[PDB]
Structure formats: C-alpha cells, structure tokens
Design a protein around this nucleic acid. Structure first.
Lengths: 166, 58, 178, 128, 70, 58
RNA sequence: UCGCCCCUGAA
RNA sequence: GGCUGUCGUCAGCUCGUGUUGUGAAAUGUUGGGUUAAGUCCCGCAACGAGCGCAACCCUUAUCCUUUGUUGCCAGCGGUCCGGCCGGGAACUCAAAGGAGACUGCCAGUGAUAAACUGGAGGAAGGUGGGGAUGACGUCAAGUCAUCAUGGCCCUUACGACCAGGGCUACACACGUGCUACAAUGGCGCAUACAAAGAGAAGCGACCUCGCGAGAGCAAGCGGACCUCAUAAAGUGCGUCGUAGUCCGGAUUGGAGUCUGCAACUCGACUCCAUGAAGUCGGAAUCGCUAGUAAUCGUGGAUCAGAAUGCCACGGUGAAUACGU
RNA sequence: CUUGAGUCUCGUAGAGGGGGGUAGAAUUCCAGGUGUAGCGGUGAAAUGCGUAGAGAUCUGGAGGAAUACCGGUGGCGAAGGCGGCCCCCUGGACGAAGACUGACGCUCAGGUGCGAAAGCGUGGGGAGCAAACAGGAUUAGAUACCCUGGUAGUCCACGCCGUAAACGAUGUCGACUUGGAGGUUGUGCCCUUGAGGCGUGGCUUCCGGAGCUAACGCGUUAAGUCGACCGCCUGGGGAGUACGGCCGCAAGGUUAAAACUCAAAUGAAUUGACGGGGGCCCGCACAAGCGGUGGAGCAUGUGGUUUAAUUCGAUGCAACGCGA
C-alpha cells in the first residue's frame, strides 16, 4: 500500500506484542512478533507482523508492514458513519456509530485501533472467545467496509439517468 | 565446547603475533613469566586511554 | 552403502615361481606381518610335497587346491522369506581364497612338527580328496547343493513378480526388495 | 539334492499317457502322476524329499519332487503329460520344466483347480 | 494359473503366465481370508481414482516437459 | 575459518553484582588480505649458478 | 517379517 | 564467566526482502538431475545474503631454484681405504622459495547442464593423502579443584606451618591395558640396516674395573660437531623336538646397584636361587578397507629419582570386500 | 387461474419387494478303485491325521450352504438394505407428446409402520467357518493374537427385541447461485450418411470458481445464498450410569438425573521429533574377512569393603591408564 506514517501528523501506536515459537531441530526458537498501527487522527491505518530476535526490531518491521497494509477510511464527525456487524475470523465483531458525548468504550484492540482511525466517539462490542489478535480484524469490519452519504446518494442519482436514456 | 575458538593460526602466519620475542635454552621460562607479569600492572594502571592492545618486542 | 570400486593389490612376482597367485599363498602363510618368516615354510613344504608325491611345482599347490574349493559359498543375511541364508555362487577369484585359507587353518589342527611338514602332507592328501581339509568342502558344498531357495526373499519378491506380468513362481523382481 | 528314489512293482498299467497333477501349495508341493485310466502310478512330495518350513513350496523343492515322482512312473513307460496346475503358491512351472527335462513332454495344458462360488466359508488364518 | 486351452507343441518353457492372467488374479488367494463388503469395494474406487487423476496429471506434466532438467 | 583474512578476537569480562558477564568481540577486519600472509620478505632463490667453495689444493 | 513390555517434574 | 566434551566433520543451520496464510508459520531450503558437499545446472513466488561444507593455510607424492657446513661424493687424487684429508657443488640430503591437478585435456555416457566412466600426459587424478579446520546450537552435561567470580560460611579458626601416617589398604567385583600359552618359536653363535626427538640440576665416548645393574678416570657437546644409541623384530648358522617343556614367567628369600638428607609401610634397576598360573579362553562383546590391520623396536614430555600409561618416530608389512 | 401438487396415456431401464421352481462349480460326508510312507501346519515347531492303507488322484452316490467370473464411485430402494438362472404376484423412479384436475400443498411433537448384525422363544436343518472349549505354540506368565481340532451359533420358517461410526458423523421440503471433465439412463434434432455430430431432461462421481468456514475443506447433489416446519445442544469427568416410569419372555432397550470433583476437556492446523510406516542416500553399520577382550597372571584406574585417613571430583558411549 502507501505510507500512513507521515511527518507532522504521524500517530504511532502499538497493539499486540508477545513471543511465538517454532520447535527447531535442536531446541526451540522465539520470534518476537507484535502488531502495530500508525494513524494520523484522520484515518490511514494498517497492521504488520514482524519477526525478530528482539522486541525493538519486532515493532520496527511491524510498522514497515503497517504502511504496506494501509486501508483508507474517510468520515465526518468523530464517529464512523455506518454500522458494520460483519465478522472476520472467529472473533466476532460489532460496531455501531454513536453520538458525540461518549468514549471509545472498549478495553481490547478496538480501543486503540478505534482511536488512530480518526474515531473516538464510536461504540463497539465483541462476542466470542477473548483474543486481542483478531479483534484487530475490525480493520476489515468497519473501517474498510463502510458507507457514506455521497455513496448512497449516487445510487439514487444513477437510476434517474437510465429512465431518461430510454 | 560449543565454540572451540579457532584463532591458533589466524594470528599465526595469517596475522601477526602479539608478543614477538626470542629466548634461548635456559631463558625460555624466564622471558615468559616476566612479560606477562608486567602486562597485568600495565593494563591496570592505564585506563585513561583506549587500549587497542599491548604488545612487546624483546 | 558403498561408493565406487574396491582396491586392487599389486604384489611382487615370486623368486621361485614368478607368480602372484602363489605370492598370495605366501601372504596367507604370513603371520605378524612378516613375509620373511613366511617364505621359509613355503619352500620347505614345496620340497616335502615333491618327494612324497609326484606332481609339479605348479600342481603341488594348484591341483591340490582345486579339490578344496567349492563353487558355491553360503553367506548370511536374515531375509530369505523363510528366515533363510542364501547360497552365493562365488566368482573364480574368491574360489582361490577359500581353499588357500583352509589349508593353513588345517595346519593349526595339526601338531606334526614344524608347519611346513603339516600343510605339505595335508596338500598331498588333498588332491585325491582323502585329507581333512577337503572335508571342509564337504559341508559348504554339501549344504548348498542339497538345499536351495535362491537369493530371492520369497514374500517380498513374490509381490514384485505378480505386478510385472502375473506370476508367483520365480522370475526377476520388478518392484522393491525393500 | 537329497530326494529319495522310488519304484513300482507293476508294468502292466501303462497306456503311454498320464495326468501330471501338480498342487503348488503355499506351504508344500505335491506332484503325482496318475495314469490316463485315472489310477495312480506314482506320487511324491516336497516333505518326503526332505524339505521343511516354507521351503517346501520353493522352486528347488518343487523340482526335486517332480523327479522323485518321475522315478515312480518311469518303469511303466509314460512320456506324455496332461498338466493340471493348481494352488496359488510357487512351483507352478518348476515342476513342468523338470518333467520336460526328465524324458517327458507336455501334450495338454488343462485346468483342474478348485474355484469356489463360496459354498464354504474361508478361515481367518494368520494375523500376527 | 492355467486354463483348459492346451499347448500341444514341443516346449520346455511355454506361455502359461498369461494363462495366469486368464485365471488367477488373487482368486485363489481369497480362500484363506475373510473380508467385509466394505474392504474390496473401496479398493475398486482407487483404480477409478487412478483413471480420473490420469487426465489431471497430463496438464502438470506438460509444464515439466517444456524445460530440460532430466 | 578464513586463512586469508585478519580475524580479530579479544575478550573482556564484567564483574557486576548481577554475576560475571563474558564479552567476546570478533571483528573480521580483513577478508582477502592477511597481515602476515602479506607484507614479508622470504630469502633464497638468489639465482647464482655457482655455490662458492674454498680453493687452493694441498 | 524375526513376538519384544517398562520409564516423576519445572531450561 | 572462562574452558571442555557431545551429536559430528553432521550437510546441515538461519536471516533480510517480497509474496502466501487470520495466525503459528510457509516459500526460499521443495522438486528433476548430480556431487563428498544448501555442490553445480535447470525448473518452480521466490529474489538475495550470512554461517557450516567446500574455500584460502600448512605438510607430503614429484621436478626445478638457492645455500653448501658439522651434510653428499660422482668426475678428480691422497690414502690410513674409513667421506678419514684435499678437492668438486653435480648428486642425495636438509628448507626456505617455486612448477604442478583445475574434471584442465581426449572419447563415450549424461538435457547439448552439472556429472559419471574409461583414456592420455604426468609423481599423482576426479573432495590426491594427512593435519589445522570441530558451525549456529542442544544436553540448567562436566569443571567454584587450573583460573575468574554473585551469594553463603569459618575469624586466639574450617585459616596457617611442621613432623610422622594414609594416596601403592583389602576378603572381593568391574573398566582399560600389558605378558604368555611356543618351532612363522625359544635359547647360543655370528650378522643386516633406522627414523624422529633429547641434552651444561644433563648426557657422557675413551680407558679401567665390575657376572651385571653400574662405578672410577676423562675428551666432547647448548650441537646436520659430541653423546643418549649398542635400533629391534629380521637374517645366516648351532641346537632343541611338541614335553607344561629347552615354552612361560608370577611369587618370595638372600645378595647387590642407583637417584636422593633419608628409599620402613609406599621407588626403580640388577644378581642368584625359587620357579607360578596358563597347552591358546563361554555367554558375550569391540576395533579395523592399506602402508591401514598386524607385529617389532626407538624417542619424548612429566621426571632429584619410577612407564606395560599418554604422546610421538621409524622397521618389516597383509587378508578380505559378490554385495548392500 | 396454473406456475406448485396429482392423475391419465405411451414407452424406458434396474441386484426394488415377496413367493415358488431350476442349473453347475466348490467344500464335506459315505461308498468303490489305484498307489505307499508320509500328510498337514509354521517364522520355526508341535497337537492332530496315516500301513487298521491316509494325503493326492480317479469313479459312483448324498447333503448343506453359497452362487466364481459376471462387476464397475454400475444400478435400484425411504432407510436398513438388495447379486447365478427362470416363472408368478407386486412397488417405486424417469422421460415423451399431449390431456385433465385445479393449491387438492409443505412440514410435523404425539401416534403408526419399516429395523443390518448379534440376541431371545418355538419348530426345522447342519457342509464349511467359528464365540465357548481342549491340546500345542509364542511369551517370564499368554485364560490371546498364532497352529490343530471344535460346540452354541451362523442357515431355513414364524414371532419377538428394536440397537449400529443405523454415516455423507451432513433433518426434511421448497427456492435460488460461476463453470469443466467423466459415468449412467430417457428423448428431440443432424448428408443421422461418423459405433456417432449437435441439443435437452433424470440420476452419479471427480475437479474447482465465487462465497462460506477457525481451518481441513464444502463447493449448483453445498458446509454458498434464502424461507417453512420439526428434532437436538448449552463445560468436561460423574454417566447414557443411578432413580422412577415405559417397552421386552429375557438379554436388555428406551426416557433420563443429582451429589461430588476439576481448570480445563475438546476440534482444526504449524514446526520439529518419533514410527518393528513408506520411499530415498551414506558410514568397518552389516555382509565378506583380519585381529582382539572376557579365561589366566601381572600393570593401572574405579566401585564395594576396611581403616584414624584410604583427600576430592568424573558416571553407558561422551566417567572408570580420566583430571593426575
């Protein structure tokens, strides 16, 4: 994709951070992996999974890859414009728009991912097994998938032209 | 053990010796001991400069 | 597991036969890696043979040994399809080795003074098959010709036979013997 | 090999022809030459040759038995075979070939072999 | 392992190992073992699995055939 | 294992209250140039067909 | 084809 | 901590970047050929790169170059006939430096690729042979006793020093070696050739004495000088005759030696006597594919003074390998 | 009203169901003949069977059970399930023109019927195989797998029980949504001038797109996208057990808990590891050879034991002539 870490407006942030393992021929190795997001407070948000032998380069590489998995989002107000109740992976995702005068209200991944993405008055919820790692798939289920007033308005405008043409 | 440290001829005719001297028949022992002793006190009393390595030529 | 050809030994001609075959008969009669002490007995026993028998210098060994060597040696390997150990028809080179070895073995079953006199008299009785070193032959060759199930490993081999054209009886094995 | 010799007391049952029965069993090999009047002349088997184990069904074991049998029919004067190969084990051309190479020739290849239509139920046999 | 059809010509070794293929196919080897209806029928469906896959293999093979690596 | 390169190697050790921490620093300064496999003078082949001898006869 | 079991724990 | 063993001299082990997967991860590194080799070639979402293999380093198999003394001796002389002296540097030798081997070349085979099989030239062909080379790691493997060090403990002591004793007890068991059980040998005679190291707390020629070990006398030597050093198996002869012996050598006693301040438990060597078990070893189990095995000596370190050990050096010198 | 459903007509194919006849092969028994010292089994064996004549082989007769090939993801049925051949009675499916009925439909707790195999009752039948059982074998033991026999049973008739990993682990019905290849069965068309060329329906495999899924995969015959109705689940162990009811002749089946106890149980997939899993490739790993050790003595270490001390550490290989 394209950069989401941009001078004078960058909004670096992290999500997960942990270690994972592979069982090698000898002993067992540890790969320092982590999820990140850089925002701008205006959308443009992504995610990356680094692999490293150290925690700093785990976040380095994950923010490289964050820019390579940027998704665009555009909105008005401090809240998302459309509810998306879609589910990606086995973590169940829900997402309402909500009037200003309320917080993010979420302790999971979607506390921080729903901050960087220019939203902070959104109300969201999740069901199913607790697992922050795929709460992050609310990139798919709300930011990537959306509707906007001028999208729906051009449905109503497309139809009129066809009747005239015949 | 895990690393056996191969350096025993990397500092041979591949890179210079770090204490080049000669000794005769009954001098072998003496020259050995005397050199090493000096270096202990030397390296300790100097720490205001960044030691690349002491060497001696006898 | 074995890569490339085996070694070959180039050895000297004898100073009384010119042979490398009967140089290999000094080699068998070496002990403690001494060819010196070996060569003694060899010639000492050559003479013993010449007196006690007719023959020739290349018949005192040769002919006598061609009555000690079997043409089949039975080796070992657990597989056989009956837990059998298979006959192996030996190459003419390995024929030599067997008989040569056995004649020296036979002189350690004797105590008839020296070592020359031992193997000499033995070789004199070994050309008419009335020795005791020719009776070693009569167990290797007796076995082999009275019992066979060949070099096939019967269960493994049979599957291979069936696939190729349909058989259960002996043929080349197309499939694995693994 | 090690197979016994055989002989018979009659030389009056010949017709110059006889069925070569072969039962190439997975655990044995029987070779029996019956006359073409359907009355025995000779018989022989691998176990009587002296073989034991599963080396009673082997090619070698089948040959020896075919030749033991040959000694038991020679005195009548027989020189034609009506080969009846049967059973699943080896020895199924071992016997044939041996006979040919023993002053007989083949004349007929016939099939008399049990083929069930499942009027009896098989055993389980081996399972180790 | 043979059929009733005869060979009347001189032989020491004759063709009778494709009279094996006109009789035996394991039909004298099923007399010492019991099976369920399930067992042999599933095996038949591995010889028609062979035949459908035969077509599929040819597409894969064609790419390899282009280049020389043998 | 390069025999045509200047393989450096020295050690240090700390002696902290956390235990002892060994240090090993291996710098591969050369890569195709020695320091005693290069820059040296051998001697002989002097290329003279006569090997001098004492003369006179007695 | 030659049966053949049994094995306290955190690096 | 440092050091080391270990699988393993294993051909493996990773990583960056991209792509694939929600992820763990994967790809690469897999496949088709091939090599000792993640070796090389081709292909394939892989493209590159690092470590290990290999690589470059030593040494040896040849031939050349220097230098010729304490080493060599042909052509040249002495002779004392001995490289002992002059002469000659040719030769061997030493040991510094080069020449060389790379599937380089020839043919076939192999995708026309790598490679494989024969061939040639050569001292040597196909990782030439042997060293160094022993990865990243795993085993909380060992080692606080080589040394280093966090904590802990001892403080007219657990510290320190000395004389005596114990480490070499002992009724046994196990591991690793060595020596025999013999004529291919033993013993007696005579006789053949070594290499590589060692050395003024040393080795010690010579000559004298001692059965000997060794002692006295003393030259030489820090040295291709001199000495240890007489190599030993081997070899030509004398014998003995298959016996527990002319095999074998344990045990003990007495008599001596040496090195030491002093050799009693607890030094080694020698002399004479005594003369062992063993007549060639079950179940089982281990090493080894060539200058190796086998066997025979020699030297070295440690060492005032103790090698069947370790470490190293040469002599003689195989059997067998169808085949996995 | 006809698009849903149903009927009529005409054909089509099939192991659909039930009943009754009929053929041969094979095993077995019995009888006769021939021939003689073995047979049979196994990795080896043994029990068992044979001179009172077996095994094999041939001829005659009899009986029971099952129908080689056929034969295939081939076919049919609601499912369970259903195979030689023929007749009789009888069910379902599908297609083709039309013709007719006119939502008459869909599903379903209860209820009712159908139920592989074993089992049970009653009566027939009994060859082979085989629980049980008895010898033998393997094993330390082997009440087993293995071998030799062998009873109930399997088989037939009737009734009963109603279970099964009763499976596509996938409720049934209706509706939709890319396709490709094969199989099978109707029917229309095309010089049918080609066993076929082009369609269009029914059924059936394999592949796979989108989509779905946590993934494996499913994938127009869905686990896709919808609706209708019913059934079930709501942590695991406790337990498909107890208790009561119900059903059964019984065996049991059916309905179906709780106390108590635990922080997991579990599914799919990833990498390595292991496999008496497979394939591939090497090494004195084996085969083939050569030489040892364990026997004996001595040398050396260790354990055990003893001692005032036998200073300490190492522990298959990788400790135990090791540190020393």
């Amino acid at each position: 994709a394209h950069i989401e870490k941009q001078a004078g407006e960058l909004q670096e942030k992290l999500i997960a951070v942990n270690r994972v393992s592979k069982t090698v021929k000898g002993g067992r190795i540890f790969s320092f992996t982590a999820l990140t997001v850089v925002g701008d407070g205006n959308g443009r948000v992504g995610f990356g999974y680094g692999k490293a032998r150290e925690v700093p380069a785990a976040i380095q590489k994950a923010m490289e890859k964050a820019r390579r998995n940027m998704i665009n989002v555009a909105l008005n107000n401090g809240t998302l414009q459309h509810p998306v109740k879609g589910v990606h992976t086995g973590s169940r995702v829900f997402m309402q728009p909500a009037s200003e005068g309320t917080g993010i209200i979420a302790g999971g991944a979607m506390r921080a991912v729903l901050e960087v993405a220019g939203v902070h008055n959104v109300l969201a919820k999740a069901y199913g097994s607790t697992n922050p790692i795929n709460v992050v798939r609310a990139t798919i289920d709300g930011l990537e998938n959306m509707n906007s007033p001028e999208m729906v308005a051009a449905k109503r405008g497309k139809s009129v032209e066809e009747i005239l043409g015949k | 053990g895990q690393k056996v440290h191969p350096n025993g001829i990397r500092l041979g005719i591949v890179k210079p010796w770090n204490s080049t001297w000669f000794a005769n028949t009954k001098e072998f022992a003496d020259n050995l001991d005397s050199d090493f002793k000096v270096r202990q006190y030397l390296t300790k009393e100097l720490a205001k400069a960044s030691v690349s390595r002491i060497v001696i030529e006898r | 597991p074995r890569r490339r050809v085996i070694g070959q030994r180039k050895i000297l001609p004898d100073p009384k036969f010119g042979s490398e075959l009967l140089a290999k008969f000094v080699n068998i009669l070496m002990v403690d890696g001494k060819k010196s002490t070996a060569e003694s007995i060899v010639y000492s026993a050559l003479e013993t043979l010449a007196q006690r028998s007719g023959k020739s210098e290349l018949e005192a060994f040769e002919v006598a040994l061609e009555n000690v060597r079997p043409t089949v040696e039975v080796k070992s390997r657990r597989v056989g399809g009956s837990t059998y150990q298979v006959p192996v028809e030996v190459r003419p080179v390995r024929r030599n080795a067997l008989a040569m070895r056995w004649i020296v073995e036979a002189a350690r079953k004797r105590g008839d003074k020296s070592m020359a006199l031992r193997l000499a008299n033995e070789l004199s009785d070994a050309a008419e098959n009335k020795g005791t070193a020719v009776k070693k032959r009569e167990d290797v060759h007796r076995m082999a010709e009275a019992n066979k199930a060949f070099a096939h490993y019967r269960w493994l081999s049979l599957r291979s036979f069936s696939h190729q054209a349909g058989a259960s009886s002996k043929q080349p094995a197309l499939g694995y013997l693994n | 090999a090690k197979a016994p010799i055989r002989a018979r007391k009659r030389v009056r049952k010949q017709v110059s022809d006889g069925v070569a029965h072969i039962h190439a069993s997975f655990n044995n090999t029987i070779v029996t030459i019956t006359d073409r009047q359907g009355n025995a002349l000779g018989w022989a088997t691998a176990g009587g040759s002296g073989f034991r184990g599963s080396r009673k069904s082997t090619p070698f074991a089948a040959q020896v038995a075919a030749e033991r049998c040959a000694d038991a029919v020679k005195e009548y004067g027989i020189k034609n075979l009506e080969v009846m190969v049967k059973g699943p084990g080896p020895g199924r051309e071992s016997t044939i070939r041996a006979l040919n190479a023993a002053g007989f020739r083949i004349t007929n290849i016939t099939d008399v072999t049990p083929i069930p239509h499942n009027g009896c139920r098989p055993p389980k046999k081996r399972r180790v | 392992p043979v059929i009733k059809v005869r060979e009347n010509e001189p032989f020491d070794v004759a063709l009778r190992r494709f009279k094996r293929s006109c009789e035996k196919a394991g039909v004298l080897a099923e007399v010492r073992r019991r099976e369920f209806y399930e067992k042999p029928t599933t095996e038949r469906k591995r010889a028609k699995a062979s035949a459908v896959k035969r077509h599929a293999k040819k597409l894969a093979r064609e790419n390899a055939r282009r280049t020389r690596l043998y | 294992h390069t025999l045509r390169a200047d393989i450096d190697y020295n050690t240090s050790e700390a002696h902290t209250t956390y235990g002892v921490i060994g240090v090993k620093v291996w710098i591969f300064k050369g890569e195709i140039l020695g320091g005693m496999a290069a820059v040296e003078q051998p001697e002989k082949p002097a290329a003279q067909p006569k090997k001098q001898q004492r003369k006179g006869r007695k």
